Amino acid sequence: GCCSDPRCNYDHPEICGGAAGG
Numbered sequence: 001g002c003c004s005d006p007r008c009n010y011d012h013p014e015i016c017g018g019a020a021g022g
Contacts, residue, residue: 002008003016 001022002012003020004022009016009020
């Protein structure tokens, strides 16, 4: 998901900061 998209991942460190997944 978001966390697998580098741009989205960069913009969402809180959501992706646990384990970054789909």
